[PDB]
Each structure stands twice: as C-alpha cells, then as structure tokens.
Amino acid sequence: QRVKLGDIMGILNKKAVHAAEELRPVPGIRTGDIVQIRLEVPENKRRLSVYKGIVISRQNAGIHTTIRIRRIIAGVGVEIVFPLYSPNIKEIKVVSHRKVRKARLYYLRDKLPRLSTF
Amino acid sequence: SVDAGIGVMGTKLGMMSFFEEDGTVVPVTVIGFKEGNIVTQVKTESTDGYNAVQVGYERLRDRKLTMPERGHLNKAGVIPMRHLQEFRLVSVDDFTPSQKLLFEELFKEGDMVDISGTTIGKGFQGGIKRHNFKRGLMTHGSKSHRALGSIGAGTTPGHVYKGKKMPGRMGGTKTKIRKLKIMKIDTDLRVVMIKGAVPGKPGNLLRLAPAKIVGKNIPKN
Amino acid sequence: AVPKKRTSIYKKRIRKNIWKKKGYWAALKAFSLAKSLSTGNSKSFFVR
Amino acid sequence: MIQPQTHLNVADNSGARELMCIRIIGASNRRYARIGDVIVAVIKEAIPNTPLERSEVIRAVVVRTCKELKRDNGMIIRYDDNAAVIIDQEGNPKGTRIFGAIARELRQKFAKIVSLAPEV
Amino acid sequence: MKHGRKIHRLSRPADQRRALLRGLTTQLLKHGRIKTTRAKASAMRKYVDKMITLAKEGSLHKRRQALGFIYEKQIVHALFAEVPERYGDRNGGYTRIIRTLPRRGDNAPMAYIELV
C-alpha cells in the first residue's frame, strides 16, 4: 500500500535521521552533559575547530534537533547552539555529566563564571 | 491572466528543514499530492474566445457531487473530483481530456515556481495590524491608544476620502508567492519539496505553475 | 451623538419589519421540531 | 541589535572602558546594528593618562552582541555583553591588543582584528 | 482569534471552570442523569471519561487523583467497585447527551447527560 498524507512528516523526519545516524552515529545527550564538539569549517581546509561546554537545553525537532552549549572564553560567556544531525559536525564526545533538576539551564546566565568555565 | 506554462494543484502538509551536503540549512516547505490530477476540459478561441485548460483534483465519493457536476466529468470519462481550476495559455494543441499531469515531467529541479493559495483568515482586525499604522502614546494622559485619529481634513473636502485605510476583514483571500526554488523531488512518496513559505496551514489547496516573467516568457503588451 | 432630524413613518416601518422578519425563521424551526417530534423516533431529544 | 543610547564595553587596548552609540554607519537610515556594522560612538568612561579623552566622538565596529547571530549552517552565536572596537577610516584598530573572541565573519572586512584576537 | 485553541470557556474564569466542571461530575456519578446546558455538557465529556479511565487501572496512584478531583470521598471508593464490572469491555464513549427544550427565563439550550 501507499503512504498516507498525514504521516509524510514523520517519514521524512525519520528517514533523514536514520541516514545521518548510520553515516555518523551520535550518543544520547541530555541537559547537563559536558561535551566536546569537532566540526569541519569549509573556510579553511587543514584543521577543524574544537568547541566544548555544558549542555543547557535540548530542543527535540526531528532532524533539526539542537543543543545549546554555554562556556566562558576569554572571560566572557558564550552560548552556541549546535544541530546534532548536521554533516559539518565530525565528532562528538561526552566528557562528564552534572547533576541537575531542570530541562533548561537558563539561570547560569546570572550565576558566577566558575559554574560554566572549562 | 496568461500563465507561462501549465501547473498542477497540491496540498500543504507541513514545513521542515533540509540539510545540504556542504552543511547549509534550507527552510523547506512540503507539498503532497492527492490521486486526481487529470484534465477535464479544453477551451479554445473558436468556442470561448480564449485558450485554456481545466484541471481537477481531490477525488471524493460520487454521492457528494451535485448531479450537474457529474455530467461535466462523465463526458470525458473522468473520475469524480472536488476542485476545478484553469490554466490559460497561448496554445493548447497538445492537451486532451482524460490526460494525467505528472509534476516531475514539468518541474525537474531548481525550477522557479509561482505558488498561490488561500491565506490565514485573521477576521475583523484593526488598523495597526492590517495597515501597519502607528500607535498613540500609552501614558501622558492620552485617551487614544490604538485608534485611527483623524479620517479627513475638515470642511474642505467635507467628506471622507474613498478607499481610506480603515479596519475590516484581514486575510482569508488569494495571494501568490513568486520565484520559489524547488529543492528536491521524491517520486516514491509522491511529494515535492520547495524552499520558502507557502500561504495557509496544512491541508490547504494551492496551485503551482512555472514562474512567469514579464519580458521572457509571456507576451509583452 | 444626537440625531439631526426624526425618522419618517415608512422608514421606521421598514426597520421594524426586519426585526419582525426574524420570527419567520423561528417559526420554521419550531414546525420542523414538532414534525420531527410527533413521530416518536428521535432518540436525541427528550421532551416529556 | 545596537540602538543609540546603548552602553557598550571595550575589547581592545585603546584605553577606554565604555561607549555610547549615537548613530549607525553603512546602513542607510537604519537604527539597529549587528556584529560587523560600523557605528558612531561617544566615550563615557576612559582610562586615566591615555590619548583618548572622556567626551570624544569616534568610529567603531561591533564585535559582540547579546542578540543572537545566525549562520547558514544552523549554528548561532550569543554573547553575554555588548562590546565594540574603535577604528580609523581604513578600518584598522588603534589598540594593539584585543580581548574576547571574534567571529569568523569579520575576516571579509576586518582581518586585522581577527589576527590579534586570542580565539575565534 | 482562537486558531488551534480547544478549550471550553463557559463565560467563567479558570478558578470557576475548574470548580464548575469538577462539581458536576460529583452529581452525575451518583445520580447518573442530570439536567444542564449544552455547553456545560460538552465540556463534561473530557473529565468524566478521565475518572472512568482511572477506574480501569484501579491502582493507588490513580485513586489519589480522583480524590483530589472528586469532591466527595465515598463516590470514588464506590466508583472503582462497579466500573470494572460495568465497563469491563467498553473503550471510550462512557456517556451520551439528549437534547431538551430551553428554559423559560433565558432561552438557554438545555440537555440531559447520562452514563451509558
């Protein structure tokens, strides 16, 4: 039988994630994880950037599933979002995991610097 | 109006993203297709004074149709269908009834396309949302906050000008989005992917036809 | 505001007949409800 | 998202501490500005015994914004402050050293600032 | 406009909605048949089916929810005793609505609601 029209969103959403997973698997990430991301930069060719920090959110949106990474560089706080299933991301690690009690760590924007330094 | 080519009709299903090989993101809109996309009638200048062709869509149960509409479709031996729209052209020498219209034969890849459908109905809205008027002060004793203000000069002219931008119904009408790039085709699922937004919510009808440009495709005047 | 002058006699009536015209549509609903109730077949309306 | 009367920090070794934007440059009749946009600014706090005085009018470019900067690959950048770097007409900074990270989008207009930065 | 908003307002704030519907279920589950308006009856189907769904999974965690919802204490203890034998096979649709003539004072469309 064919595919019903009310389900095509899930199929395309499920199909792309399956292709990206076999091409590049990804572990299970939750709020509070401390990760280390390696992503290709088409501007240069030789090396790749290395961004790390604590996960302060995880928005589930299918193929465009995101994670926000807070980390303090050069004394100033910096929050960056990363789509998990992008082809630019070459490698992800999970260094450790902090104990938390919420889904989104927005309070750290007002807390001290040491809570986000790495 | 005169169209540059022949289009079809589909239904909005939703909206999502599309990751390229290099990694660029593309906000893409999805459009499905029901069963029926068959031609119903062919018009000519000898009969109607203009050249065009009808197209039906969204097959349904026969009992739901009015009996006049049945005879219109039963002439060409065509299944029952709900909607009907035309596509005006310059020449219709290569079209007949009972003819299917596959979109992949007409829209291959990266082709600009003019989407058209019904917008979201906002209802009886004011001037700030409809006509983008500015707002009055919220403090300093002002009584008028979201009102229009003056609607005329005074004794001269002595009446309100016609077509004055005033409240009323907003949305729910027909629009057309021009020059949208097609990203990908998928004949397995019978679905098409187009960059950008589309008027309406999922389940809404629309027509997509080749992009018409003034001096290139259509006859100038 | 305030009216400049008084409404005439027949312009008044034309506006009253519209108010009365609503009774025409209310009577049809009642007749449809009775004939749809004097048969004892509707299981969605308890009249007692 | 830098409106006039906005108090900005200083990232370079120019010898200033705070600025106040009054106008925008490059964008015709625009009122806001993102990273990479040039602005006219007014000093409000300066370092003692430095070439820059307290109430000078200067040109500068935004390097950090608390508003989010979107990229093409879905990545987004966000800072926890608003800052800028003074410049000349050519666009080179007066300060010899730079603080804070800089985005890679400035290389097309301001490559000198990208080089002097500690990180990117 | 209310596009995508599925909620019965009943011309009352939230504190009164949460009490009005909560109070009618106490009367229906003990009487089995009441006379109310049609707007109140339509909003009632969502909550009566919830309490009946708790009785199918007649556990202790599911009982404490009904006690917080249902005002009186004896009906909840009596509700779980009879529903598994009465609705041991039905899957949803635990009530019907029968229309009725309106009232004399305000022409409010009235209707009965009962448990199948």
Place this chain on the structure above:
RNA sequence: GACAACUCUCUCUAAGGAACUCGGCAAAAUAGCCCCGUAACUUCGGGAGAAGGGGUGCCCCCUCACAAAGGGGGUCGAAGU
C-alpha cells in the same frame, strides 16, 4: 452563549534602557529583622534608617538553652523577611 476590532481593570514581554515627554506623567524597582559602616554642613539638638555593604531556610551539636543572640557542621532549591 460566543471568545472580532476597540475601550477600561490586570499579568508577562526578547535586545536596548528615558532615545518617550512641556516634564521620568505613569509604571517598574527598593522594602523586614540582626551585624558592619556611615560624609560635607550645623542653631551641637541634628543631618541619619545618611549613603553603602554582609547575613537570613530546614536538620544535628556546642548548651545547662541563659527568654535570646552567637559559634561549628550538614543538607535542598534558580530563588530562604
């Protein structure tokens, strides 16, 4: 009953923070108790709660509870008058 504009009575509002405006009008913020520390000027009475900072929950012990306060230790939360 319904849940359009618009008005009034209320809540929140990204980035910026008086650029509004005749005018910071209005709104917002501050707030209690216990400690630390409090200027010019002065009719020596005041100024003064000046300003400006720290602490604040719950549990155990010190402790004999001495009605208190204080000290030590532990623990929950983004946030303890």
Place this chain on the structure above:
RNA sequence: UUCACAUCGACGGGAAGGUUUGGCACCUCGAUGUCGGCUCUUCGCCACCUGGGGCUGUAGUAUGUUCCAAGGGUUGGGCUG
C-alpha cells in the same frame, strides 16, 4: 584677463500667485472652540535628492545655471510651551 547676457546684473519698468504683515468689516454673537505637538491622510510645483537633457569662463572627478518631470522619497537627537 579683453567679451553686456557662462555666472551676477545697478538704475528703472511690466506681471502672475493668494502661503506673510495689513486695509475693508460681506457670512457667523439664541457660540464657526485656540498656539504647538501625536495619530492619520490627500493634493499643488515656483524641484532638496532620485530619472532624462541643453549651455558653461564644462579637461577629468565635482559643480554652477536652466528645461522636461510631482512616480517615489525627504532621518534620529540636544535647547525652546
């Protein structure tokens, strides 16, 4: 630089327009509510910018003066009621 008319043009003259200050006191005294500002328009050209030309004491860039042209556009602030 010589050359009245590239650009200014004294001395005087002839006009249009109805936005200035005024003259007259014709409508309104059993009422035609004011200055400025906010909001929201809409027309006119005697053209500030944008389009297209002529002349130049226009090399070029940039102007200057003037013709067609009113389609569109004509910022945010400090002081002041």
Place this chain on the structure above:
RNA sequence: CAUUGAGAGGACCUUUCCCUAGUACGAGAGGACCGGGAAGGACGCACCUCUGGUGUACCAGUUAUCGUGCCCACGGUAAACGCUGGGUAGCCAAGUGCGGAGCGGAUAACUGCUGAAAGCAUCUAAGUAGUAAGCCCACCCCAAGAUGAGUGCUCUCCUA
C-alpha cells in the same frame, strides 16, 4: 461549477561596493560616461522548519493558612495564575522566505535624418527615427448590480 475583464485598486522605490579600470582625460595630482555583477536600506505580500516572546490547556519548585479523621499524599484560597522557574499547538516579530521584471507601446524636454516656401539654409506647416524614476499595457488582488446584468460545459422541468 468553471470563466472573459469594461472598470478599480495595490505595487513598479533606493544607497554603497566590486569588475570594466587606476583604462579615457590630465603636466601632475586626481580620476570616468556607458555596460555588467554583488551586498544592503526602506516598504509590501506571506510563513512558524529555525531563534525566542506570550501561552490563566499543561509540568515542576516553594511561603502562609483552612480542609480531606490524623502521618504520608492531595485539593481550595492568597482578585481576573499566591509568588516564581520552564513550555507544545496557536498567535506574534526581533525570526524565516519572496518581491519590485520588460531590446513592450506612445510621448515631454533635447538631439536628429530627409527637405520646401526662400535656386541657399532650416529637425517640419508632407513624412520619419532615437529617448525620461513620468503616461498606457504587462506584474498582484477584486470584478458582469458592467441593468451594457456577458461567455462556455453540465443538469432539471413529474402526475392526472
């Protein structure tokens, strides 16, 4: 049901940079017309995949007090959330896409070609060609109450 479009409206806006080219010009400084290609501004038509606001559907934390016999656990109130921390759909912009095209027509100012009256000359009182963000059409929406009420396909008009 599908439609022609008399008429009507909306929108056709604009800056900078690069290439041509440090070329033409000019002693040198300095620095192009035309043409082409990018990035913006403002405005407009849409959209919620993305980033977020709100979200008195919902989830969680917590102060005081009343009640459910009491502990545990829950509920009510602290206007129209007790105060806060998050939030799907929806709505929304700060967010996301698109838009402004024409070597099409006729002109204004101006430049002209051919060439009389006037054996010369003259852009013209015959004829004709270039050419403006302007005018008309084309682009987008409405539209036969356009009483000038249109056009086309299909259907129905039973019984005595």
Place this chain on the structure above:
RNA sequence: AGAGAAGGUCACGGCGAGACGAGCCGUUUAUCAUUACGAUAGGUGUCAAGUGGAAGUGCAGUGAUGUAUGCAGCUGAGGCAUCCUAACAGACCCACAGACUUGAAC
C-alpha cells in the same frame, strides 16, 4: 389540485472560516487493493512533544535528606489508528419547455 425536479435553506456534528450572517468539511461511517474515494468532533489506544525523575516500598543516615525500582510519573490544543458516544428525527421553498416580432432554415 396532488406529489416534491435538479438544486437551495434550516436542522444534526465541527473547523487552521467567523462579530452575527456568510464560507468550508461531514452526517452510519464501506467493500475490494497494488494500491489514493467512507473517521466530522469528542473519547479511548498509540506516537511525537513538554515538564524532568511520581506514588508506594526498600536501602543509607540521629535527622533534614539522599538513593534504587524508573527516559519514571503527569500532560499530550498535535499526528495515526479505533465507530465507543453523538451526526437521530427529519422540516420548508422549489418543476407552465420558457409571452409577443422579424429573418434564415425546414
């Protein structure tokens, strides 16, 4: 006069349509399958998603409390299945082959 043409309106169940009217979808829910039409709303089941680790019990601790059972528990305005309840009853308007002239056909 009888009877109810096409078709329209009310009524019944609803909406990404809407001030009210209007407009749109649906009104016994199919059977066959290489195939698309017969699930409107609510409920139920399931999934995405949101919040972020329920109750009870056991363990550790003098205790506050922590910890295991446990991606738990709750929610699920959304998607897909499922006729479980309600679209029952039915009502009104409506059917002169389209006057008269002229021409060409017949």
